[PDB]
């Protein structure tokens, strides 16, 4: 209780409680899935709604022509980090006239987000990110945490009840690398839908898709443009 309120205070057990509390912010948001084939990187996000009269929250954001993200946590921090990534990409294009390698952008995210976890009066970024990108090393799915740690993934899921999605993806990793785009998005949608009780399922009103690849810039499908993906899926079990 005395080691809870500052990010500059180590616990006697070698832990920083503010960082972990910040990590808990990711689980507060709606779940999201990211997976890559060998040609495409795909983000599938479950949009959440307050009431039935409120539109669904944006979960997928455009960063650069070759990079997009899916957020999970505080939308303000998400917008901040997003603008940062956008700025870094623009800088890279301005200086070198070539798109910024995704891994380097992720490294910069790590460096930036690490700073406030070591200064008094500062706080960690209350947001988790799934980054889908394509460069001359192929497609990439990355994950960034409030603890400023980042991971290079074959597949990943973060947020509320994302454990189900994780469990699903962990079985189909081997399938992922050879799937075509439609099958990849399918797998993503199944993983995403696993994080739901049987009384509810995916809809064109509550599902967003972000796709980037060797033949496609990062694009966001939101409403009627999602139907070609949903229509072509199993009935799921109970």
């Amino acid at each position: 209780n005395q080691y809870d309120n500052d990010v500059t205070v180590w616990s006697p057990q070698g832990r920083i409680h503010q960082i972990e509390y910040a990590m808990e912010a990711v689980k507060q948001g709606s779940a999201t899935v990211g997976l890559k084939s060998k040609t495409h990187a795909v983000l599938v996000a479950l949009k959440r709604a307050q009431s039935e009269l409120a539109a669904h929250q944006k979960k997928i954001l455009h960063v650069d022509n070759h990079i997009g993200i899916s957020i999970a946590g505080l939308t303000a921090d998400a917008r901040l980090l997003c603008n940062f990534m956008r700025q870094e990409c623009l800088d890279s294009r301005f200086v070198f006239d070539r798109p910024l390698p995704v891994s380097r952008l992720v490294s910069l995210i790590g460096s930036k987000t690490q700073i406030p976890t070591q200064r008094y009066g500062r706080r960690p970024y209350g947001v988790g990110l799934l980054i889908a990108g394509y460069d001359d090393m192929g497609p990439h799915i990355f994950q960034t945490c409030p603890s400023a740690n980042y991971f290079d993934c074959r597949a990943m899921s973060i947020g509320a009840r994302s454990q189900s999605a994780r469990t699903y993806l962990e079985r189909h990793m081997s399938e992922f690398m050879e799937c075509n785009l439609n099958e990849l998005v399918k797998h993503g949608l199944r993983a995403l839908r696993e994080t739901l009780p049987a009384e509810q399922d995916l809809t064109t009103k509550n599902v967003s898709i972000g796709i980037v690849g060797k033949d496609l810039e990062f694009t966001i499908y939101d409403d009627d443009d999602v139907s070609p993906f949903l229509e072509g899926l199993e009935e799921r079990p109970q």
Partner: protein, 245 residues
């Protein structure tokens, strides 16, 4: 060895018995991390890291605990990873500045000294908290020799022949002592490193793990490089076989 009545909430505050508990807590954060060892032979330095895998979903080579600080200097980290990466940035920048100012590759002892001073600068104020990681810097040159240094969260820097940091630090040190690295070569050493890593690893409590390896010596023209897949799989085979005795 356990006081905490407000005397352990800051690095700007001494304990009544003359201790800075924040630093020690950071060291405990280092202790809770997976073990990373590094050993110096007569012709260079070899690094080995027990990189625990938290999920099969993660790509191979994710969360590298082995860094390239300079073209002639490698870095093995243990503990809070973000801090370790920031420290890697600081070390890199220090080496770059040294080159830009003096015109040659930075001597390892000096780099270790500088970075260590930077680390120590955090064990003194309430405005910042000590780094939660320990690390090892390895290098080789013909005019300098083979060198291996280590820095803990307090800012202490020392030169080692063999060193380990993490959970089974002592358990690894007892295994390193058995070796005669003052006569052996980095080629033979890799196998022994992988071996000690597999020995020290606890297959029960900790789940699956990936092994990281790093060269820096005469066999690499003074460049710090990753161990080729061939030699790595060879060393892992030697280790898995040596675990049946």
């Amino acid at each position: 060895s356990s006081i905490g009545t407000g005397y352990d909430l800051s690095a700007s505050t001494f304990s009544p018995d003359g201790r800075v508990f924040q630093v020690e807590y950071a060291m405990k954060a280092v202790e809770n991390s997976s073990t990373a060892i590094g050993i110096r032979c007569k012709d260079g330095v070899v690094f080995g890291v027990e990189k625990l895998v938290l999920s099969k979903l993660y790509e191979e080579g994710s969360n590298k605990r082995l860094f390239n600080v300079d073209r002639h200097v490698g870095m093995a980290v243990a503990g809070l990873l973000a801090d370790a990466r920031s420290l890697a940035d600081i070390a890199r920048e220090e080496a770059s500045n040294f080159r830009s100012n003096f015109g040659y590759n930075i001597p390892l002892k000096h780099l270790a000294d500088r970075v260590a001073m930077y680390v120590h600068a955090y064990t003194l104020y309430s405005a910042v908290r000590p780094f939660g990681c320990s690390f090892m810097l390895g290098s080789y040159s013909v005019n300098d020799g083979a060198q291996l240094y280590m820095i803990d969260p307090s800012g202490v820097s020392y030169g080692y022949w063999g060193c380990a940091i993490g959970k089974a630090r002592q358990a690894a040190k007892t295994e390193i002592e058995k070796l005669q690295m003052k006569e052996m070569t980095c080629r033979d050493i890799v196998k022994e490193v992988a071996k000690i890593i597999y020995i020290v690893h606890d297959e029960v409590k900790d789940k699956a793990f990936e092994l990281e390896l790093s060269w820096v010596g005469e066999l690499t023209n003074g460049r710090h490089e990753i161990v080729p897949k061939d030699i790595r799989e060879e060393a892992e085979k030697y280790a898995k076989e040596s675990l049946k005795e």
